[PDB]
Structures are given as structure tokens and as C-alpha cells.
Design an enzyme around this catalytic site. Sequence first.
Site, PDB file in Angstrom:
ATOM      1  N   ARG A  48       0.796  -1.230   0.000  1.00 42.42           N
ATOM      2  CA  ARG A  48       0.000   0.000   0.000  1.00 42.42           C
ATOM      3  C   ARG A  48       0.835   1.290   0.000  1.00 42.42           C
ATOM      4  O   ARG A  48       1.717   1.456  -0.844  1.00 42.42           O
ATOM      5  CB  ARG A  48      -1.013  -0.046   1.155  1.00 42.42           C
ATOM      6  N   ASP A  52      -2.480  12.156  10.049  1.00 47.32           N
ATOM      7  CA  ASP A  52      -3.884  11.984   9.663  1.00 47.32           C
ATOM      8  C   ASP A  52      -4.587  13.333   9.582  1.00 47.32           C
ATOM      9  O   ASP A  52      -4.660  14.064  10.570  1.00 47.32           O
ATOM     10  CB  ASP A  52      -4.610  11.058  10.655  1.00 47.32           C
ATOM     11  N   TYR A  90      -6.414   5.094  18.513  1.00 53.78           N
ATOM     12  CA  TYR A  90      -5.813   5.447  17.220  1.00 53.78           C
ATOM     13  C   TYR A  90      -5.620   6.962  17.090  1.00 53.78           C
ATOM     14  O   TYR A  90      -4.548   7.421  16.693  1.00 53.78           O
ATOM     15  CB  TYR A  90      -6.638   4.923  16.032  1.00 53.78           C
TER      16      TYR A  90
HETATM   17  N1  LIG Z   1      -5.036   4.905   4.151  1.00 57.99           N
HETATM   18  C1  LIG Z   1      -5.678   5.988   4.589  1.00 57.99           C
HETATM   19  O1  LIG Z   1      -6.914   6.394   4.039  1.00 57.99           O
HETATM   20  C2  LIG Z   1      -5.055   6.781   5.698  1.00 57.99           C
HETATM   21  C3  LIG Z   1      -5.755   7.787   6.357  1.00 57.99           C
HETATM   22  C4  LIG Z   1      -5.147   8.505   7.384  1.00 57.99           C
HETATM   23  C5  LIG Z   1      -3.837   8.204   7.739  1.00 57.99           C
HETATM   24  N2  LIG Z   1      -3.156   7.214   7.074  1.00 57.99           N
HETATM   25  C6  LIG Z   1      -1.787   6.892   7.472  1.00 57.99           C
HETATM   26  O2  LIG Z   1      -0.944   6.706   6.352  1.00 57.99           O
HETATM   27  C7  LIG Z   1      -0.105   5.584   6.556  1.00 57.99           C
HETATM   28  C8  LIG Z   1      -0.298   4.570   5.430  1.00 57.99           C
HETATM   29  O3  LIG Z   1      -1.643   4.139   5.329  1.00 57.99           O
HETATM   30  P1  LIG Z   1      -2.009   2.609   4.950  1.00 57.99           P
HETATM   31  O4  LIG Z   1      -3.483   2.494   4.868  1.00 57.99           O
HETATM   32  O5  LIG Z   1      -1.167   2.224   3.792  1.00 57.99           O
HETATM   33  O6  LIG Z   1      -1.515   1.783   6.235  1.00 57.99           O
HETATM   34  P2  LIG Z   1      -1.849   0.271   6.680  1.00 57.99           P
HETATM   35  O7  LIG Z   1      -1.870  -0.579   5.464  1.00 57.99           O
HETATM   36  O8  LIG Z   1      -3.127   0.187   7.412  1.00 57.99           O
HETATM   37  O9  LIG Z   1      -0.606  -0.117   7.613  1.00 57.99           O
HETATM   38  C9  LIG Z   1       0.676  -0.183   7.037  1.00 57.99           C
HETATM   39  C10 LIG Z   1       1.490  -1.292   7.687  1.00 57.99           C
HETATM   40  O10 LIG Z   1       1.603  -1.092   9.076  1.00 57.99           O
HETATM   41  C11 LIG Z   1       2.166  -2.281   9.580  1.00 57.99           C
HETATM   42  N3  LIG Z   1       1.853  -2.593  10.983  1.00 57.99           N
HETATM   43  C12 LIG Z   1       0.626  -2.685  11.585  1.00 57.99           C
HETATM   44  N4  LIG Z   1       0.813  -3.044  12.873  1.00 57.99           N
HETATM   45  C13 LIG Z   1       2.138  -3.193  13.095  1.00 57.99           C
HETATM   46  C14 LIG Z   1       2.879  -3.549  14.216  1.00 57.99           C
HETATM   47  N5  LIG Z   1       2.280  -3.815  15.373  1.00 57.99           N
HETATM   48  N6  LIG Z   1       4.254  -3.613  14.117  1.00 57.99           N
HETATM   49  C15 LIG Z   1       4.900  -3.334  12.926  1.00 57.99           C
HETATM   50  N7  LIG Z   1       4.153  -2.985  11.818  1.00 57.99           N
HETATM   51  C16 LIG Z   1       2.802  -2.922  11.905  1.00 57.99           C
HETATM   52  C17 LIG Z   1       1.609  -3.419   8.727  1.00 57.99           C
HETATM   53  O11 LIG Z   1       2.681  -4.227   8.280  1.00 57.99           O
HETATM   54  P3  LIG Z   1       2.508  -5.795   7.910  1.00 57.99           P
HETATM   55  O12 LIG Z   1       1.428  -5.935   6.867  1.00 57.99           O
HETATM   56  O13 LIG Z   1       3.831  -6.299   7.386  1.00 57.99           O
HETATM   57  O14 LIG Z   1       2.128  -6.582   9.139  1.00 57.99           O
HETATM   58  C18 LIG Z   1       0.909  -2.699   7.586  1.00 57.99           C
HETATM   59  O15 LIG Z   1       1.182  -3.300   6.344  1.00 57.99           O
HETATM   60  C19 LIG Z   1      -0.448   5.001   7.918  1.00 57.99           C
HETATM   61  O16 LIG Z   1       0.443   5.492   8.892  1.00 57.99           O
HETATM   62  C20 LIG Z   1      -1.825   5.548   8.189  1.00 57.99           C
HETATM   63  O17 LIG Z   1      -2.149   5.652   9.556  1.00 57.99           O
HETATM   64  C21 LIG Z   1      -3.748   6.501   6.072  1.00 57.99           C
HETATM   65  C1  LIG Z   2     -11.883   5.094   5.695  1.00 55.93           C
HETATM   66  C2  LIG Z   2     -10.561   5.375   6.423  1.00 55.93           C
HETATM   67  N1  LIG Z   2      -9.639   4.397   6.460  1.00 55.93           N
HETATM   68  C3  LIG Z   2      -8.457   4.530   7.090  1.00 55.93           C
HETATM   69  C4  LIG Z   2      -7.470   3.553   6.962  1.00 55.93           C
HETATM   70  N2  LIG Z   2      -7.670   2.486   6.188  1.00 55.93           N
HETATM   71  N3  LIG Z   2      -6.307   3.700   7.624  1.00 55.93           N
HETATM   72  C5  LIG Z   2      -6.090   4.773   8.410  1.00 55.93           C
HETATM   73  N4  LIG Z   2      -4.934   4.891   9.053  1.00 55.93           N
HETATM   74  N5  LIG Z   2      -7.031   5.724   8.559  1.00 55.93           N
HETATM   75  C6  LIG Z   2      -8.210   5.628   7.917  1.00 55.93           C
HETATM   76  N6  LIG Z   2      -9.191   6.623   8.074  1.00 55.93           N
HETATM   77  C7  LIG Z   2     -10.288   6.747   7.080  1.00 55.93           C
HETATM   78  C8  LIG Z   2      -9.852   7.733   5.999  1.00 55.93           C
HETATM   79  C9  LIG Z   2     -11.548   7.252   7.779  1.00 55.93           C
END
Ligand SMILES: NC(=O)c1ccc[n+]([C@@H]2O[C@H](COP(=O)([O-])OP(=O)(O)OC[C@H]3O[C@@H](n4cnc5c(N)ncnc54)[C@H](OP(=O)(O)O)[C@@H]3O)[C@@H](O)[C@H]2O)c1
Ligand SMILES: CC1=Nc2c(N)nc(N)nc2NC1(C)C
Lengths: 249, 243, 248, 248
Positions: free
Chosen positions: C13, C141, C154
Site C-alpha cells: 500500500r 492523519d 488510534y
Molecule cells: N489509508 C488511509 O486512508 C489513511 C488515512 C489517514 C492516515 N493514514 C496513514 O498513512 C499511513 C499509510 O496508510 P495505509 O493504509 O497504507 O496503512 P496500513 O496498510 O493500514 O498499515 C501499514 C502497515 O503497518 C504495519 N503494521 C501494523 N501493525 C504493526 C505492528 N504492530 N508492528 C509493525 N508494523 C505494523 C503493517 O505491516 P505488515 O502488513 O507487514 O504486518 C501494515 O502493512 C499510515 O500510517 C496511516 O495511519 C492513512
Molecule cells: C476510511 C478510512 N480508512 C483509514 C485507513 N484504512 N487507515 C487509516 N490509518 N485511517 C483511515 N481513516 C479513514 C480515511 C476514515
Amino acid sequence: EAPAAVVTGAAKRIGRAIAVKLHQTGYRVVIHYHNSAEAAVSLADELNKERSNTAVVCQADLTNSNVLPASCEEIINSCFRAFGRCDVLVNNASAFYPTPLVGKTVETQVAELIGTNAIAPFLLTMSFAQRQSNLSIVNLCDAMVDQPCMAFSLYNMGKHALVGLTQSAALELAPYGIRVNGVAPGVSLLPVAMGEEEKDKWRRKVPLGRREASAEQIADAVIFLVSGSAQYITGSIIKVDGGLSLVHA
Amino acid sequence: EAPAAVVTGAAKRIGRAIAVKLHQTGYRVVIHYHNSAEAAVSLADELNKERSNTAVVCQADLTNSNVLPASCEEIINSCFRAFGRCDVLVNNASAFYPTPLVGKTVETQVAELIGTNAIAPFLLTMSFAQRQNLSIVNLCDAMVDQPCMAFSLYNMGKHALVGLTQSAALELAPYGIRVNGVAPGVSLGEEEKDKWRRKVPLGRREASAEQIADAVIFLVSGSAQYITGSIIKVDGGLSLVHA
Amino acid sequence: EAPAAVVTGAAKRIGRAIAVKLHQTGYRVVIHYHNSAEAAVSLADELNKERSNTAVVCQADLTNSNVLPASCEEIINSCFRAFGRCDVLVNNASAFYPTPLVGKTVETQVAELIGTNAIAPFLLTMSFAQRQNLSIVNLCDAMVDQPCMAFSLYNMGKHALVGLTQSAALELAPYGIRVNGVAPGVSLLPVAMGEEEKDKWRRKVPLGRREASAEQIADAVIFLVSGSAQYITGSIIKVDGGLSLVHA
Amino acid sequence: EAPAAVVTGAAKRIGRAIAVKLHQTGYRVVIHYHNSAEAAVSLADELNKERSNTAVVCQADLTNSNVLPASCEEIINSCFRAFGRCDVLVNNASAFYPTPLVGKTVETQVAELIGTNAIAPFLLTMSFAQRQSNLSIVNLCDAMVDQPCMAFSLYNMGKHALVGLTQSAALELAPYGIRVNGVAPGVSLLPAMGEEEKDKWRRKVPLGRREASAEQIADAVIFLVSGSAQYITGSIIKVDGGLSLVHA
Ligand SMILES: NC(=O)c1ccc[n+]([C@@H]2O[C@H](COP(=O)([O-])OP(=O)(O)OC[C@H]3O[C@@H](n4cnc5c(N)ncnc54)[C@H](OP(=O)(O)O)[C@@H]3O)[C@@H](O)[C@H]2O)c1
Ligand SMILES: CC1=Nc2c(N)nc(N)nc2NC1(C)C
Ligand SMILES: NC(=O)c1ccc[n+]([C@@H]2O[C@H](COP(=O)([O-])OP(=O)(O)OC[C@H]3O[C@@H](n4cnc5c(N)ncnc54)[C@H](OP(=O)(O)O)[C@@H]3O)[C@@H](O)[C@H]2O)c1
Ligand SMILES: NC(=O)c1ccc[n+]([C@@H]2O[C@H](COP(=O)([O-])OP(=O)(O)OC[C@H]3O[C@@H](n4cnc5c(N)ncnc54)[C@H](OP(=O)(O)O)[C@@H]3O)[C@@H](O)[C@H]2O)c1
Ligand SMILES: NC(=O)c1ccc[n+]([C@@H]2O[C@H](COP(=O)([O-])OP(=O)(O)OC[C@H]3O[C@@H](n4cnc5c(N)ncnc54)[C@H](OP(=O)(O)O)[C@@H]3O)[C@@H](O)[C@H]2O)c1
Ligand SMILES: CC1=Nc2c(N)nc(N)nc2NC1(C)C
Ligand SMILES: CC1=Nc2c(N)nc(N)nc2NC1(C)C
Ligand SMILES: CC1=Nc2c(N)nc(N)nc2NC1(C)C
């Protein structure tokens, strides 16, 4: 064919650096200016030598008044006259001086400080929007808005309103595909006439490098926000301050 | 003797609640109004019946103009004229209507929205300070960072009002003047009313004018004498709700 | 010599997007992963196929514990082991699930959510600075102030990440280490999430009624690590398409 | 009957002022303390002398651990077992000391700083809500969270997380009639500390060039729990004399 940008207050300092970097990226530019006629004409001349007919000058007082809406319309109109399109607007022009609460009359100070920093940016945004790819507006804000210079209320009010406009217009112009952002300098280029001992006082306060930002370093953030690397960025204000805003009293 | 307060736009609604509650606390009040002449004189009558010679009205347009500085100086003057002192300024008066970016001209729209919400508060702060538990309370907006669609000018004004609150708190501190803010979320047809009320996490209702006034009353009180440059949100959790 | 970067949670991702982007900019990368072994090694092989000896994996749990400080030092030691340098740290790994105020135990929930989002980034920043165009980018975030209902832990972790981003920018500035953040709104949505619910989050976004591609998030990260951001520290760039600006 | 309140770290200073002022308003109080036994018991006596059966003490470490959820549960329980009700929780207890990025181990420093400032307030909020007029919680925050003290990353992270919790619990507990608010002091009661270093912080404060008394901080807490705040939730009130507005 080349995109076109309007930069307000582009004759000197940060404005010029933005106009030069946009032009160097391939933009055709409108160099807006108020008093600095020589510096603006010189800049246009410099840029036109590099690439034929890619720069024009446009003079306008951006002080708030009855004629400001038409003056802003004309700034945007001049971009269409010259280049047939208007893709970018950089609200850079700003009046900056103290207005203590306790020559100019206060109504004049209001007009200047609120006109340049907030009202004109709004009126220019209106004309940009109405006159319409990668469209965006970048507003030059202030990293120190929540820790203001003493006795700079009207300036601070204008810069605060500008944050408000950046956010309001991002929301409203999003459906039209227009992104709206800000770059917020802390301490950048200081006045040449200002004593180096006074410059140093502000420099010593910057955690990152103990020095002020160059004009180019501010322009670098503007170039980013207008680029394709920022097609999902809107309503964001990027601080370029070297940690200044994070330092306590 | 009794302290004196100026409340702008105090003829109706939130402003009325603020004037009443300040009066009930023991303040002599100036009830500034613009168009609501009938309501202001009625309120002045009501308060004076309770305590003789503790309320006066003061008419003024707070649209931006070259005479606005003199209109704001006169409002403060009117407080010294009636009561011989001016302890509290409450910047409540506010123009609020949409101004889309895409027969009110824009010059008028800018004058009214930026004037009422920001420039008038600034000039009044000036005149207040020049004439001096002194404090100023600015009526802000809890939704400034999440604004109504097509309300750029109104929002720009409220944003500036935040800027003033903070700048004036810093600058007027050495004088003993505290400068603070109260930021309502949803306060004062039925279907659209219902829609906004449903959005509020706490009780799914709007704030009563008195609940807003309560926050104004705290900030001017001795229980807030170390509080300056603060904006207290009175929104029932509205600003915390995502899209 | 080519610079080296550590990207936490880079097997999938957004983390992979950041790792691939850095590698394309000429960075050598440590792909840290937790459970996703296959995906991390699969990214390692693919990046090594393009340039020899430029990618390695590093397994580590980032749940809060007494050994977590050692685990974070080891992620950093591992970048020096492979590449002899560590120029960039991207705190991306993140636990994300609800923790209602009114099955994992609550202490486990505290350990994972505060661990991954706040404490591990703090410890990695510690180790990064200790072991010395240096910068750290934290994945924050955009919605930290209008949080998801029942996501207190979170959200607390993400708020703490802002605290860290600003604290470390202040403290590591005299050392030449810049500390910045990238705050996505809605980006890549959960794998488990159905298409109906995805479109609900998509329709909220003012700019294009769509989520940010992992690539668009990485673009913001690459800006902050680049020389175009040499004066930028303690800044958190929203990449939310104006999502945070939309009221209830 | 009289309403009941829990005040964490209430044995002295700001915590004591809040407990004294709440009791003065007509509240019965659970005085939580960690090490200040003689001070807490002394306060209990004093308040009980004023009104019989209105003050009790409860000892607990609020350092983060596997036993902390049970610890926070029992603090809330001490209020119910003594008074049959719990209407107010003031999260006041706090560890504060430097944790530089460059003999307390770092894992302990994490436990103490994040535990006291963030995790304990979270678990106490959980217990308070689940065990449920005018119900509200007040979290003691920090006006200087965005211009933090040098080398105080862990403390600042914890306070940032407390903002997060205040906002998160405000949204989530709103349907239950529980309001969640914050009071953020700037420079209040010192330290002891060098008087030369004390006067240095004092001179920075625009309003009066002095620190806030503990009473002045308590005044804002009393307002937030009062009927004059029935519509206020998710709000953090600064009591800082303008300190947070002063540039470097
Ligand atoms: N995606 C969104 O819409 C969104 C929104 C707001 C903020 N963010 C922030 O942007 C970043 C990327 O988003 P994302 O959705 O790509 O993240 P994600 O897929 O939910 O998490 C990324 C990786 O975090 C690792 N992880 C989880 N628990 C762990 C642990 N206990 N120890 C070590 N690694 C751990 C996992 O690795 P493994 O798979 O190898 O276990 C997972 O693949 C994140 O920091 C997220 O909080 C994303
Ligand atoms: C739908 C959603 N998914 C999320 C996701 N997958 N991972 C993180 N860290 N944060 C999230 N917040 C929103 C944008 C509300
Ligand atoms: N420099 C810093 O350290 C710093 C710090 C914080 C924020 N900023 C922001 O960054 C931006 C650029 O900084 P800067 O220092 O380069 O700006 P600046 O020199 O102070 O002003 C830029 C230009 O604004 C124009 N201007 C002033 N009043 C005008 C008016 N009434 N009508 C039309 N134009 C007017 C002037 O044009 P003419 O010369 O042609 O008359 C001037 O050259 C500004 O918006 C500023 O607020 C800068
Ligand atoms: N109500 C809410 O849900 C809400 C939400 C956020 C913020 N606020 C803020 O809280 C404050 C009070 O709210 P409200 O709803 O009671 O306000 P309001 O009724 O909309 O306006 C209050 C008063 O402002 C005066 N006014 C308008 N234009 C003026 C002008 N040009 N010159 C002088 N006075 C003028 C009017 O006086 P006359 O009637 O005498 O003409 C009016 O009575 C306002 O500042 C508002 O912005 C309210
Ligand atoms: N004072 C200021 O200038 C200032 C500035 C900004 C924010 N604040 C905030 O306002 C609140 C009150 O300030 P303050 O100066 O009165 O705080 P403080 O004296 O430094 O600490 C208050 C109490 O916290 C308790 N405590 C510390 N570690 C604990 C632990 N591990 N487990 C359980 N209890 C523990 C202590 O109880 P025992 O004595 O019984 O051991 C202490 O008396 C704090 O939350 C603080 O962060 C204060
Ligand atoms: C330090 C500085 N700040 C400025 C500011 N904030 N806004 C404007 N328009 N101009 C500025 N110029 C100098 C005096 C260089
Ligand atoms: C419903 C509503 N009404 C308002 C009103 N009447 N006056 C002001 N100034 N602001 C308002 N904001 C919202 C919350 C959009
Ligand atoms: C300046 C100071 N700040 C503190 C703070 N912010 N939080 C806690 N718990 N304790 C503190 N103690 C002193 C030394 C009085």
C-alpha cells in the site's frame, strides 16, 4: 503549448523568485507590480530574452477601494490578453507595517493592509474562477499568524483572513477542479536597509540553520503545490519556516 | 459603582442575551443596534425598569468605510457619556450571507462582511483601549476551519476576528485589558432548522442564546482574570464531526 | 554513494509506494514489515532486479513493550548494516481499528495503537539521530480533529505523532535533521472494506470525489525528503483533497 | 444528594486547588495521589472537618502497564463505593521531565509520561463512562503544546494525545450526556526550581508578568463542570496569560 501564471508583487524578492521559477518550469508569466516599475519591466525583459513573449507587466494598487474589484478583474484579464489562458494565481503582494492599537489615517491602513493581504486575493480568486489541466491558486501566508508581531494587528488580521480564504476557496472551487493552497514563510529575505545586527536577532531564532529562508526556498514550495506532484493537495498551507513557529517565548 | 459594558448588535438574539446577562450581573449597558431600533429601545426600557439609568441605546452602521473609525469612536464615547466609564466591549454584531466566488455589489458585500466581523471589532478595540477588570469578548465562529459553502467573505472576516483576538490580547496585556472569544457552532423553515440541529452531538439541538451569553459572562468575570487570547468554543461538539 | 532510507510497514500500500518512490529517486531502501513477509521480500527482489544490492527487508513488531526500544535500534542498525548510512526515516507502519469507550484486551489495544503510531516513531527517531540531506517523515492523519467515532486510541496515537513531529523538528534542527509530516485524508481504503462503503468515503472528498492513490501520498513524502524542502521542518502537509474542510 | 468528583494527583498544587474548589462548590471528592500520602490524607481531614463524609483518598500509580486498566477502574470505583455516584472526573496527574532524543530506562520514561498524561486519562474515561444531572470530564492539558519545551518529546506527545482523547471522548460520550473538556495552563505554579529560572518564565507572560495561581487554573475547571457550560464539549480553554501568543 505553455501554461500561464499571474504573480502579484513579482518585481522584487519572494515574488520575483516565484515568477522566475514558474518561468524556468515553462510557464508564461504576468508580473504584477505596484511601485517597482523599473524592477518589473527589467524582470519581464530578462524573461522575454530567455523565451520570446512569455512575460508581461501589469500595474495595480491592490489597496482596498471601490475600484479594486475592476482592478483585479483587469489583472486576470491581462493574462488572457497576453497568453490566452490563466492556469495559476500566486497571491504574493502584501503590505507590512505596524498599526498600534494605542502619516496614514487608520481607514487608509485598513484599506492597504486588509486590501493587499485578503480582499485583493479574494477578488483575484473570483476573477480567476469566473474566467475559466492543472489549475491552482497559491496564497503567500504567514507561519507566525498565531504568534504575531507586536502592534501588527491589521497585518495579522489580513493574513488570518487569507487562511480563511485559502480554505473557503479550496472547498468551493474543488468541483471546478481548482486547487487552493498556501505557502507560509517564517523569516525569509529581510530588508536590505535593516541592520545586520537586527537581521541576526531573527536569524538566531530559527532552529534550522540559524538563518532566514532564501526567496528561492519559498518559491520551491510554490512550484511543488502547482506541480503534478500535488494534484490531490488542496486547502493545505505549507510552512517554510525552519522551525521558527515551534519556538516558545 | 457599577461597571459599564458595550455590546454591539444587542437589540436581538445572542446580543440581547449578552446585554441582559451582563445587566443582571450588575453592569450598566450600551445597547448598540443598526436597524432594529424598536427592539433596542424596548430592551433599554426593560432594563431601566429594573434599575434606573443603567441602559442606553446607540445606533451605528458598522459597514466598512472611511467614517467607520469615527463611528466606532462614537460608540465608546457614548459609554463614557452615559456612564463615565467603559469596562467591557462585546463585539457581537455580524453580517452573514453567502458570497459565491463563481442587488448587492461585491464592494458592498466586502464592506458589510469584513466591516462588521473584523474591521469594526478592530476600531472599537482601538477606541476602547485609547479611552482607558477590563476585557473584550469577540463573538467568533466554531466552524471557521470547516466553513459553509460559498461563505468566503463571512469566513475571511471571522478568521480575521481570531487574528484580532490574539493580536489585541498580546498588545493590550500591559494595560490590563484581556481579549477573548466565544465561538458558537449552531445557535439561534423547520426542515432546514432540523437538519443543522441533527448534526450536533450533544443533545442534537442548537445553543440557546443564554448558553452563549454564559460563556461571555465567564470571560469578563474575576474567575477568568488570567485568561487572555483564548477562544472558548460553545458548539456541543459540532466542530468535531467529520464529513 | 547513494543515500539510504528506512520505510516502516513498506510491504504494502502506501508504505510500498513511498519505498518504490525513494528507490526510483536513487535511494537504497530498508523495507520494514511485520506480518507481510512474502510481500516485503517480493518488493525487495523487484527493487534488487532494477538495481543490485539496493533493497533489504527487516522484520519487526512495533507494538509497545519494554523491548521496543531495542527493536527500533535494530531497524536502524539494519540500515547501516546493509548500506553503511541512514539518511531518511519514514514512519509509516500503523495499527488502525476501533477502541470503543463503552477479542483484544485493552492493554493490547493500547500497546498496538499507541505503539505503532507514536512510541515506535519516537524510538526510531531516537535511534536515527543517535546513529549519525537528513530528514524524517511521519505519516499523520488529516482528520485528527474530526476523528472517526470510537477511534480514541488510534486518534490519541496520531495526535501524539504530531507532538513528536514538532518536538523532534525543534530538537533535531541543530543537527541538520528535518522532521516533517504527511497527513492523508482518505487514501487507500481497507482490503476488507466493501465497494459500497468505499464509495461513501469517496463521495465526501471535494477534490474529485475520490481517494488519494498511494502514489499521491508518496509524492508529498518525496517532496519533504528532497532538496526542494531544505528549509521545511515541523510541517505537516495535508494530502486530503480538502476533506478536513467539509463540515458535518 | 451532593455530586461526587474524582481528581487525580490532588494531594498538592493545581490538583489540590481543583479538589478544594470543587468541594467548596458542594462536591464530594476522591483525592487521588501517588507518592504524596501525608499531603492527601491531610487534605482529606481538612475537607472532612468542613463537611463530614465528603472526602476520601485513593492511591495509584498511573504509569502505563498491564495492571493500569484495573488501577483506573478501582479509582472510579472508590468514588462509587464511598459516595454511590461519580459525576465528574478531573484528569490532573502528570509526569513531567526531559527525555532528550540525543537511571531511568527509555521504556520507563514512555510508561510514566504517556501513561500519566494520556493512557490513564483514557482508561479512567472508559471506567467513568461504563459505570454511568451534569456529567462531565476535565482534562488538564498544556497551552504550550505547539511551541514545546526543548527535549521534552515524550511529555509533549502525551499532552498531544490528551487533546486527542478530549476531542475523541467528546464526540463519543456526547450521546450519553457526558461532556469532555480541557484546561490548558501556560506557566502556573512552579518549582522547587531556581528562583532565577522561575522569574525567567514569569517575565515572558504578557498578562501580569507572573504565573497563574493554582486557584486561577481551578476557576476554569469549575466553569467547565458548572451549569454555565452545559453546551460546551470538546473545548480546551487556555489559562496562560497570553504566553502561547508570544513569538520566539
Ligand atoms: N489509508 C488511509 O486512508 C489513511 C488515512 C489517514 C492516515 N493514514 C496513514 O498513512 C499511513 C499509510 O496508510 P495505509 O493504509 O497504507 O496503512 P496500513 O496498510 O493500514 O498499515 C501499514 C502497515 O503497518 C504495519 N503494521 C501494523 N501493525 C504493526 C505492528 N504492530 N508492528 C509493525 N508494523 C505494523 C503493517 O505491516 P505488515 O502488513 O507487514 O504486518 C501494515 O502493512 C499510515 O500510517 C496511516 O495511519 C492513512
Ligand atoms: C476510511 C478510512 N480508512 C483509514 C485507513 N484504512 N487507515 C487509516 N490509518 N485511517 C483511515 N481513516 C479513514 C480515511 C476514515
Ligand atoms: N519576507 C519575509 O520574511 C516574510 C515573512 C512572512 C511572510 N511573508 C510573506 O511572503 C510574501 C513575500 O514576502 P516579501 O517580503 O517578498 O514581500 P514584500 O516585499 O513585503 O511585498 C511584496 C510586494 O507587495 C507589493 N505591494 C505592497 N503594497 C501593495 C499595494 N498596496 N498594492 C499592490 N502591491 C503592493 C509590493 O510591490 P511594489 O514593490 O512593486 O510596490 C511588494 O514588492 C508576502 O506576502 C509576505 O507577507 C514574508
Ligand atoms: N447564531 C449562530 O448559530 C452563530 C454561529 C456562529 C457564530 N455566530 C456569531 O455570534 C454572533 C451573534 O449571533 P446572531 O445569530 O445573534 O447574529 P445576527 O442575528 O445574525 O446579527 C446580530 C446583529 O448584528 C447586527 N448587524 C448586522 N449588520 C450590521 C451592520 N452593518 N452594522 C451594525 N450592526 C449590524 C444586527 O443589528 P440590527 O438588527 O439592529 O440591524 C443584528 O441584530 C455573531 O457575531 C455571529 O457571527 C453565531
Ligand atoms: N504547572 C504548570 O505550569 C503547568 C503547565 C502546563 C500544564 N500543566 C498541567 O496541569 C496539571 C497540573 O499541574 P501541576 O504542576 O500541579 O502538576 P505536577 O505537580 O507536576 O503533578 C501533579 C501530580 O501528578 C502526580 N503523578 C506524577 N506521576 C504520577 C504517576 N506515575 N502516577 C500517579 N500520579 C502521578 C503526582 O502525585 P504525587 O505528588 O502524589 O506523587 C503529582 O502531585 C498537570 O497535568 C500539568 O501537566 C501544568
Ligand atoms: C520580515 C518581513 N516580513 C514581511 C511580512 N511578514 N509580510 C510582508 N508583506 N513583508 C514582509 N517583509 C519583511 C519586513 C522582510
Ligand atoms: C446554521 C448556521 N447558522 C449560522 C447563523 N445563523 N449565523 C452565523 N453567523 N453562522 C451560522 N453558522 C451555521 C452553523 C451554518
Ligand atoms: C514548568 C512546569 N511544567 C509542568 C508541566 N507542564 N506539567 C507538569 N506535570 N509539571 C510541570 N512542572 C513545572 C516544572 C512546574
